[PDB]
Write a structure and sequence with these properties.
heterodimer, A: Aspartate Aminotransferase, domain 1, 2 domains, 14 strands, B: 388 residues, Aspartate Aminotransferase, domain 1, five-stranded antiparallel beta sheet, 11 helices, globular, binds ligand C6P, 2Fe-2S (chain B), PyrdxlP-dep_Trfase (chain B), iron (chain B), metal-binding (chain B)
């Protein structure tokens, strides 16, 4: 029996180097950076270094803005409610396009905007678990204010064609925001190559601390503040800076790009080992194409067994995983398949989500394979099918 | 910097090593998401319950009440103001908010943006004692006032507001009462049912907690449209993954603050009074606000020949960290020159020096600050061609 964490898409471990980078900024260095005295200014070089690491990690340019928020939920709320305020309540627009598979910080915010009279189209997802750019083009009207599509999905790990969608959005002169939380540390992130106007990210998903996130804004494009007040973050987001959070986020982002550039294949190899071994069990289906999937994610549907029961049995075995909604469909020459679906859909059964990190070991994968096969056999012996 | 001395505690505070130790496991040792169902996520749950319990116990909240953990008091203020605007103004029959001219910018600028949305806002000016009295609030409440937002204690003068009396008047009028209570925790007794407030904002980095975490108290879980929508965190009132280290540290820090309250009433007050009396020994110096209504850790002193920003820079060169405060000139009832608080926007406002202590201030820090303060005043008055 060994404890094994494979829920990294939900949250990640803080790299000991990140915690070490953060440590001084609680008790040794505690001044407010907005103070003029030496106590406040002592942390300023660390803040500049952190912001530089962030800009370098996502490929933003000097004209661009990167506002430090409390979480990606704040960033998504900010983008949606601010563009609603700027272009919809005091503009000539009334439409926002998104997908059925967004994070609740996008979906519920869009539903509240719907409650305010905003027309929103929640774009359904294709067989590949993705939304394609031509459907976006077809749904853009002359009143669409913003298109908000996640960069990569948190349940399936499917990567969205963010560059093509950006090209379509620029042709129609409409703003483009992406929830890039699942992208940082897992796929190359270049926000001018992706052409996004806004990007949300969260540090505790690439091994930074919880409680700090960010919103990237191309060229400092106007966006009414969600938090008003002092002139923090260039007057775009008030509230005292989470100095430890900022330092740790910068360090974690730098480390994430470093391990993406060298250790991409170690994590990808372990995911592929786990997925191939699990698919050796009869009547198991991995959701989404791997050649378009983040290197760390598997979403498996097991037949007869229920995803939550599989999670409970794994947790009793010391293995932490999560859920993901999937639906049943047919292919074109290998008919039975499981495809991504909105959690609200009535067609949805629950599949098991296993998400690795650069800290996963091959021993964890061997134990996980063995215990997965044991749990499948055990729960199918007790299954109603 | 002959000796480094921190007297800018009203701006931010050092993290108590016990608070940092309480936080330590929840970065690398305990990292699961508390919203997960597996054991990795649920491992931190008892610490979260204990931290939330410490908060309820520290401010005297009841079980029916709600305490939502935010990212900072700025988030709490934005949330309260914009939410009551959404609830009672854009989808109600109300259109008026009453506040003061001395609020923190997270309240003032939010109110200005709401004015830009058509909300009537009256920024009540402050009296000689540096406070807003309850009868003035009563005089400005109409049947259209949606919310009254008045800070519990001032961050520049430390003056304590009569939040209880204002609450009684608000209850007579059936209007909601919010207080920005950031300056109150750890400095004065905080009892949110005795204060009768409906909302209270607070920020952990003011009472030796970490930066990046705050809270909003809600008296009966009163409806308030979420500032952050999404998952059902904090009872569905503020979504976003929990800042577990921040929450743990905030609970520990608030418990420590209530324990150290008597230390701050007695010893910290004694050191503040030493520093203030020593400074007031300098000719043509004026302390803003009456001490008998002031938090034990705050001084806002006006010097006559000297300029406030130059005085702060000169103190920092001596290793002393302080801040500013806006002040105006007046006379008392005996027609004696005194300095009184004023909104920073007023053209009658000059800059005063703000010195704020903490439970970690030592008497050596106070003696060194007295000496260097007197030296800097003499130096800056010695070069003036105008001082009499
Ligand atoms: C009364 C009051 N209300 C809100 C805040 C802001 O707290 P946050 O957690 O950063 O949002 C503060 C902190 N203001 C600091 C620095 S901005 C001062 O120099 O006085 C405050 O004093």
């Amino acid at each position: 029996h060994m404890k094994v964490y494979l829920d990294n898409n939900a949250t990640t471990i803080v790299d000991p180097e990140v915690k070490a980078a953060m440590d001084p900024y609680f008790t040794q260095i505690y001044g407010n950076p907005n103070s003029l005295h030496d106590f406040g200014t002592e942390c300023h070089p660390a803040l500049r270094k952190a912001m530089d690491q962030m800009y370098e990690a996502i490929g933003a340019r000097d004209e661009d803005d990167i506002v430090v928020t409390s979480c990606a939920t704040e960033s998504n709320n900010w983008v949606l409610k601010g563009v609603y305020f700027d272009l919809i309540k005091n503009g000539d627009k009334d439409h926002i396009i998104t997908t059925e598979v967004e994070h609740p910080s996008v979906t519920a915010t869009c539903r509240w905007l719907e409650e305010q009279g905003v027309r929103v189209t929640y774009l359904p997802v294709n067989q590949d678990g993705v939304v394609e750019a031509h459907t976006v083009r077809d749904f853009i009207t002359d009143k669409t204010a913003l298109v908000s599509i996640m960069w990569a999905n948190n349940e399936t790990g499917a990567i969205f064609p963010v560059e093509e969608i950006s090209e379509i959005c620029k042709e129609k002169g409409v703003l483009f925001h992406t929830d890039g939380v699942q992208a940082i540390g897992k796929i190359p992130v270049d926000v001018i190559r992706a052409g996004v106007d806004f990007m949300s990210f969260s540090a505790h998903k690439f091994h930074g601390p919880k409680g700090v996130g960010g919103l990237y804004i191309r060229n400092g494009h106007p966006l009414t503040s969600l938090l008003h007040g002092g002139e923090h973050m260039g007057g775009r987001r008030s509230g005292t800076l989470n100095v430890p959070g900022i330092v740790g986020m910068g360090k974690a982002m730098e480390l994430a790009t470093y391990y993406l550039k060298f250790e991409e294949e170690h994590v990808r190899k372990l995911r592929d080992k786990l997925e191939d071994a699990i698919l050796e069990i009869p009547d198991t289906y991995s959701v989404g194409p791997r050649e378009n999937r983040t290197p760390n994610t598997i979403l498996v549907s097991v037949r007869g067994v229920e995803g939550e029961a599989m999670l409970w049995d794994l947790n009793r075995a010391g293995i932490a995983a999560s859920t993901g909604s999937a639906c049943a469909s047919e292919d074109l020459e290998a008919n039975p398949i499981m495809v991504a679906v909105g959690a609200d859909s009535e067609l949805a059964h629950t599949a098991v989500r296993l998400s690795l990190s650069r800290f996963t070991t091959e021993e964890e994968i061997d134990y996980t394979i063995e215990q997965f096969k044991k749990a499948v056999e055990r729960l199918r012996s007790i299954s109603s099918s």
